[PDB]
Amino acid sequence: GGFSKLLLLWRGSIYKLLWRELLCFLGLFMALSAAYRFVLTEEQKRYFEKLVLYCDRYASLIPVSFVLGFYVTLVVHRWWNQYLSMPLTDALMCVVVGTVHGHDERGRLYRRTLMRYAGLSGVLILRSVSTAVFKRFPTIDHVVEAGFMTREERKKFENLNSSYNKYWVPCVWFCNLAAQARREGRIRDNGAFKLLLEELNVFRSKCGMLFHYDWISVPLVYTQVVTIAVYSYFLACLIGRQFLDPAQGYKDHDLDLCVPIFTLLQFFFYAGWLKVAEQLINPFGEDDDDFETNFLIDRCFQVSMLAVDEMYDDLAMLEKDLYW
Amino acid sequence: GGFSKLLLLWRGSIYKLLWRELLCFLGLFMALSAAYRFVLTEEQKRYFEKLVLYCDRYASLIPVSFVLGFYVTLVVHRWWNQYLSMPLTDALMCVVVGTVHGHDERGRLYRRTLMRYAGLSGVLILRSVSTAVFKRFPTIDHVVEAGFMTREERKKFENLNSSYNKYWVPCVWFCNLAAQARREGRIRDNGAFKLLLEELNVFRSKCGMLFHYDWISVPLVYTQVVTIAVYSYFLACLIGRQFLDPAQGYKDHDLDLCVPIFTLLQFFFYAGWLKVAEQLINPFGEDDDDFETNFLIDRCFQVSMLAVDEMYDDLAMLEKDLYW
Amino acid sequence: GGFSKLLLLWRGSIYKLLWRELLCFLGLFMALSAAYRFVLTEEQKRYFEKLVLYCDRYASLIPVSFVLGFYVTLVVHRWWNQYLSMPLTDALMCVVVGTVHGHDERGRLYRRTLMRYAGLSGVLILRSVSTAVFKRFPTIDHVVEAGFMTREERKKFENLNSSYNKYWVPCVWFCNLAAQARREGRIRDNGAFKLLLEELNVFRSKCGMLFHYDWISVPLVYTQVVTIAVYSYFLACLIGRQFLDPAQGYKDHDLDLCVPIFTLLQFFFYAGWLKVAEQLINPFGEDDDDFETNFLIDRCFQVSMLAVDEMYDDLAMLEKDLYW
Amino acid sequence: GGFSKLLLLWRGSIYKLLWRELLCFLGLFMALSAAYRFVLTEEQKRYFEKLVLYCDRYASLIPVSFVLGFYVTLVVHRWWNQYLSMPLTDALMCVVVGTVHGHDERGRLYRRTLMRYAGLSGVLILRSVSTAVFKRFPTIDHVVEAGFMTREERKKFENLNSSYNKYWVPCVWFCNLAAQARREGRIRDNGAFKLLLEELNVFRSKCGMLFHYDWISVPLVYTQVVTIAVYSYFLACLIGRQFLDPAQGYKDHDLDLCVPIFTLLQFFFYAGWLKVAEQLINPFGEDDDDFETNFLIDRCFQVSMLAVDEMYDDLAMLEKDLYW
Amino acid sequence: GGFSKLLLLWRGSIYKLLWRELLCFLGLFMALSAAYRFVLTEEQKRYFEKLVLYCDRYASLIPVSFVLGFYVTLVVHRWWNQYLSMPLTDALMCVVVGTVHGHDERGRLYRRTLMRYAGLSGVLILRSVSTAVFKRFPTIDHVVEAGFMTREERKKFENLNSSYNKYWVPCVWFCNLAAQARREGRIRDNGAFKLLLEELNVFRSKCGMLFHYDWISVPLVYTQVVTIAVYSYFLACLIGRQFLDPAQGYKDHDLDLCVPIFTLLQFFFYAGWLKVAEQLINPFGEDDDDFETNFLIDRCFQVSMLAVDEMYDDLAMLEKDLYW
Numbered sequence A, B, C, D, E: 001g002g003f004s005k006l007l008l009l010w011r012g013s014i015y016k017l018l019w020r021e022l023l024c025f026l027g028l029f030m031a032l033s034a035a036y037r038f039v040l041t042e043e044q045k046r047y048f049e050k051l052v053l054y055c056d057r058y059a060s061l062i063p064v065s066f067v068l069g070f071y072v073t074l075v076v077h078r079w080w081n082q083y084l085s086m087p088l089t090d091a092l093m094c095v096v097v098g099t100v101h102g103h104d105e106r107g108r109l110y111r112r113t114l115m116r117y118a119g120l121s122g123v124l125i126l127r128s129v130s131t132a133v134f135k136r137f138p139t140i141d142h143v144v145e146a147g148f149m150t151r152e153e154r155k156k157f158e159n160l161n162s163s164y165n166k167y168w169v170p171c172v173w174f175c176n177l178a179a180q181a182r183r184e185g186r187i188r189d190n191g192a193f194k195l196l197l198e199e200l201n202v203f204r205s206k207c208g209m210l211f212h213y214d215w216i217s218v219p220l221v222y223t224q225v226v227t228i229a230v231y232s233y234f235l236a237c238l239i240g241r242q243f244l245d246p247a248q249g250y251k252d253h254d255l256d257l258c259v260p261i262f263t264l265l266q267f268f269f270y271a272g273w274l275k276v277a278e279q280l281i282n283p284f285g286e287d288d289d290d291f292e293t294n295f296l297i298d299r300c301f302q303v304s305m306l307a308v309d310e311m312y313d314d315l316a317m318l319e320k321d322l323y324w
C-alpha cells in the first residue's frame, strides 16, 4: 500500500504523540478489569455489569466525529495560512537590486541595509511568535551579536517610547532610507520608488499577520468542547467495553479477550484525530513537524545579501541561444 | 494530555458560559424525578413510563450535530473575517513617513494630521460596532477630549447634513489634506500621491467592511433553527433519560443513578457547541475573549504618532555590517 | 439563554415563514388520524397499521441533514458574496475629490456628474436584479424624475442600438468625462487619471458581478433534489408517525397522544432548515431580512454629493494636537 | 411552499435527466419480482428470501451521502469558478475608450481593432472548451466569415509554427497594436499605456484559466468512486427491498405493495444528487442549464463595438442636476 | 447513464490503482474461510463464530466516511492550488513584447534572454518538485544541453555560495537585465519598467509557492490517522463478514455465498476513496493523471520565443472590419 508504509514511521508520527496516552488508557482498563477478576465482591460485580451495559448505550462514535472533523478542518486551514504569512524577503530583494543603483560602497551600503532592515523586522516578529526563534535570540543583545541590528540602531530602538511590540520599527527605517536614496538619485525612477514602498507594505503586512494569528487563536471555548467530547467517549468506553463474564449470559458480552483491541484502535483513531489539532494549534515550536523557522531565517538573510551584493549588475554577456 | 490541561481553565472557558444552564437542566431533571419518587400516583407513573420510552425514541444526537457543525463553521468564518477588517494604520504610516516631507513644523502638522484623520475614522467606525469602544466614547465630545477630533474639526463635522453614519468624513478630509500637500510640494512624487490615495482607500474599505458585517449578521431564521434543534433535543432528554424503577422490568432502564452523568456530558457537548456560536456572533463586546479593541485603538495612535514624528528622517549612519 | 431569547421574535423569524406549512401538516395529520378513529373499517385499519410500520422504517433523518447542510452552506456562501458586490461609490468619491480640481462651477459640474454617473450605473443594475428597486423605478422616466439621469442623457441612452442591458453605459460616460477633465487640466496628475479609471473598473466589476449572480443561480436540479428529499421525509412521517391503538399491541406504538409534538419539532427543524435557503436564494426583494437596497441607494447618492461638493477643499486650519 | 412549486418544472429539471434511469430501475424491479411470483420454484424462493434479508443489511444510505455531499460541493465550487473565468471585454472597453484617442478614421481603426483582438481571443478559447461554440465555428474559416478575424490576420495566424493552442496570439497582437498607438501619440499618457497592458493580462489570464479547468478536470478516480458507491446501493436495494410473501412470516416484510415507492423516492434523491455533479462537470455544452456562451459571445462584441465607436467622446453637455 | 460509461475505463482509473489490494483482501478472505471449512477443529470453530459476531459489532462505516471526506476535501483543495502555482510565462511575454523595443539583434537578444530567464527559473523549480522533470534534467549540464542555461550563465551560477535552492537566481538576472534595458533606452517608459518588475514578482511568487507546497505537505499524523481508520475497518470485515455455517443457527448469518460481494463493493468504495488522496498528495510524478509538466515546459518556451521574436512589431495593416 501507498499510505501503508507510512504507519512504520516514528519521526513526528502518530505513535510518537499518543504512545503515552495509550498505556494510561490500557493500564486503567486492566486495573479496572482486574478488580472485576479478584477483589470485587459477587453482589457488586452484578452492579458493575449493569453499569457496563449502561455506558455502552451512551458511547456514540458519530457526534464526536462531527466535532473533530469541523474543528480539525478549521485548525488546518488556520495553520496553512500562518505559513503563508512567513516574512520572506525574496520579493523585496528583486526590487532592491533593480531600483537601487551604484557600484560604489554607498550603493552597496544602501542595498545591504535595506535588505537587513527587512530581515531584522522578520527576526523581531518571529522571536515574538516562535519559541524556536526566541531561544536563538533571548534578548535584543543576541540580535546585535547576530548582525541583524547594529549597536547604533539599538540605541534609538531602545529609546523609542512604546509599550507595544516594535517589530514595525525597521519597516519605518526602510521607508526613511528609500526616501533618502530617491532624494540622492540612487533610485532613477519615481515609479521604482513607488514599487519599493508597495513591496515593503506587502512584507510588513505579513509580519502583521503573524502577530494577528498569534494573538487571536482558535477560541478556547471551542477547544474545550471538542476535548470534553473526546474524553466523554473514552470514559464511556473505559466502562462500557469491559469484558463481563460469560457465565452471566449477558447478550453481546460473550468473550473474555482481556485486551480491548478494537477499543484501542478507536483510541488511535479518536485521540489521534485530536492530536492533529494539538500540533497545528501552535506550529512555531521545537517539535519535529513544526515550521523550520531558524533554517528559514538563515536563508532570507543569506540569499538576500547574495542577491543585492554579488549579483548586482553582474550579468553574462548576451549570447545567441541554441534556438536562435 | 495537551488539550487536557485546558479544561481546568475558567477565563473565558466553557464552564464560565454554561455553568448556569446546567443547574437549570439538572435542577429540572431532579424536580421531575422527585415527582416520580414521591407525589406521582401509581397509575400515572405507568403513564410516565410510557412517556419516557416515547421521548428516548425521538432523541437523535446525529441531525443536531449537522445543524451545529455547519452553523458554527459559518459563524467562525465570519468571525475571523471581522478581525481582518479591523482599521489598522500601520500601512498608511509607512507611506506618510516616506511620501510627506519637511523637518519644519508644517511638515509635522501634515504627518500628524493625516495619521490622526485615519485614527479618527477608526474611532468613529468602532464606536458604532463595538460596545466596548462605545462606553469609552459615549458622545462626540468624548472624542474631542481624547484628542482624535479638534473642536474646529467638530463644528464642520456636526454641520454636515447627513442622516447616515459619518465615519467616512475624516477619510474625505485625508484626501483634501493630501491634495493640498501635493500642491505645495510637500509630496515630491505624483506617484507617491497616488500611493497615499491607494492606501487610504484600503483603509476606508476596512472601515466599510466592519459596518457591512455589523449590519448584515447571520440570518435570524438560521439562528432560530439551530436553537430550536438543540433545545428540542434537551426536552427529548429531560423526559426520555429519566431513571424508571427496575421493578417494572423495562428494558434498558435497569439502574436508578439519580444523576444523568452521560446526559450532562451531552449537555456540555451540545449546549457548549452552541455557545461557541453565541460568543462569536458579536465579537466586539466586553467579554474576556472578545476582540481587545480599546488596547488596539491606543496602539494605532501611539505607534502612528511615534512613526511619523520622531522616526521621520532619523536614521543611523550607514555602517558596514558583520558580513560585508 | 443567549439564543433562547431570539425564538420569541416574529420579525423575519422562523414562525413568520413556516406557521402556514405547520397547519397544512398538522391538519393533514389529524384528518388522517380521525379516519383511523371513526370511518376506517376494522379490517382496513389492520392494513393501515402495517402501512405505518412500513413508513417509519424508511423515514431516516440522517441523509436529509446531509443534503440540507451542504445545500444551505452553498446558498449562504453565495448570498454573502452577492452583498459584497453591491455597487458602492465611497471609493470613487475619495478619488474624485482628490484628483478632480476647481472651485468654480465647471469643477463642481465635473465632480457631481462623475459621481452621478456611478450612481446611475448602480440604479440601472439594481433595478434589473432587485424587485424592491424595480417598483421604485418601473421605467427609465422614473430615473429621470429622480435626478439620476437627465433628459439629454436619456435621448442618447435610448438611441443606442443594443438588445442587452445598458447598465454599463454610464460607466463609459465616466471614462469620456474623466478623459475630458484630464485634457483640460482639471486633473493635475496623469497617475491621478489612472487611479480614476482603476477605481471605476472596480466599481463596474461589482455591477457586473450582480448581473452574474442574478443570471447564474444555484442549479435548479440541485434545488429540486433537496426539496424532494425533505418532502419524501414528511410523507414518511405523515404515515409512519401515526398513533396506532395500543389494543393491537404493536411494539413502540403504545400511546395515543393525538399530537405529533416530536414530529412537529422535526418539522420546525427540517422545513425551517430548508427555509433558510429559500429566503437567501433571492435576497433582493421586499421581505424584511432582504438586503435594504432602497435605503442603500439613497446613501451612496447623499454621501457622494456631500463629499465632492461641500467637502471639496474645505479643511479646518492645521492645529497642533493634544499630544504634540 | 416556496421550493414546492419548482418540482412541477421540466426545463432542465430533475425529471428531465432521471426519468430514463427510473424505468430501467423500476422495470428491473418488476422483472425480478414477477419471477418470484410465477417462474421461481418453491425451494429456490426460500433461497431468494434469504438473499433479500442479506442485501438489506448491507444497504446503508449514510456513507453514500458523505461521498455525494463532499464530491458535489467540490464540483459546484469548480463549476462556479469556471463561470468567473469567462472572457468578458467590458473592463478593456472602458480603458480603450478613455486611453486611445482620435475622432478620425485611424483612431476608430485603433479602438475597433483592439476590441476585436480581445473578442477574437475569447472566440478562440471558447471554441476549444465549449461544444456549443465549436459547432458555431467548426473551422477558422468560420471565424473569418463572422468578422472576428480578417483574411490578412488569418495568413500570419496559420503560418506561426506552433503545435499548441493559439488563443494567446490575438493577445500578443493587442500588445503590438497598443505599443504602436503609444508611439504615434494616440495614447497621451504612459500610465494609460500601462493600464491597457494591465487589463489585457487580466483578460488573458481568464482565457488561460478556462484552458486550465478544461484540461485538469475533477480526478477520474474520484468520479468512479462516487459512481460505484451510488450503484452499489441501488443493487443492494434491487434485491434487499423485494416484497417477500407474508405467508413466510419474515419480520419487517409483511406487505406486498408491488411498487417500491420509498425505494423510488430514494432513487430520486440519490441518483438525482449524483445528476447535479454530472451536469456541472462540463458546463459548456448545448444542455438547457449550461452556460449560455453563444449569447455571451454576441454581447461582448456588440457592446464593445458600441462603446468604443459611437460612445467615444460623445457626452451630453454638463447640466446642473436636480439637487444642485 | 452519464457517469456509468466511465467505470469501463482503465487509463488512470480506480481499478488500475486498487486491483492489487482486492486480491490481497479477497485472497485473505478465502484463506481464512477455507480454514473454517477444513482444518479448523469443531470446538474452535465455535470460538471462531463468537469472534465473527464480535468483529461485525465494531465495524462502523459511518466514522471512516467522516475522516475520509474531510481528509480528501483538504487534499483536493491543496492539489488544485498546486496547479495554479505552475510557472507560466504568458503574462511576462506580453509585457516583454510591448515594453522591450528594437528590431535589431540587441533588441532580440533582450527579448529572448528575458523570456529564457523566466523559463530557466521554471525549469529549476520544477526539477526540484517533479520527478518527471527531474529525470529529464538529472544534472545542471542537462539544462545547458537543452538551451535554458548557457555555459557562461553556468559558471557564475555554480560559483554562487549558497547551500539553498538556486531557482531564484534567474529571477535576479531578469531584474539586472531589465534595469540595463531601461538604462539604454530599450524600455521607453519608466512605468513600463515598473510593469516588468511587477509581473516578474508574480512569476517568482508562483515558483516560490511550488517550493512551499513541496516542503509543507499534509501532516503525516493526519495521513496516518485516516489510514489506520480505513484499515481498522477492513480487519473488522475480514473477520466480521465471514460466512458462518447455517447449521449453528446464528442470526443474520444464514447463507454461505463464499464471495463477500457487498464487502468487496465496500472495499471499492472505502479503499478507493482513500486512493483519491494518495494520487493527489504528490501530483508531479510519472503517473497518467499527474500534472503533464514536461509538455507544459515545452509550451512556455515554444510560445514565449514565438511571441517575442517573430510576433514583435509584426501586425497586419489596419483594415475596416465587417461591421464598420
Ligand SMILES: [Cl-]
Pocket: none
Ligand atoms: Cl502604478
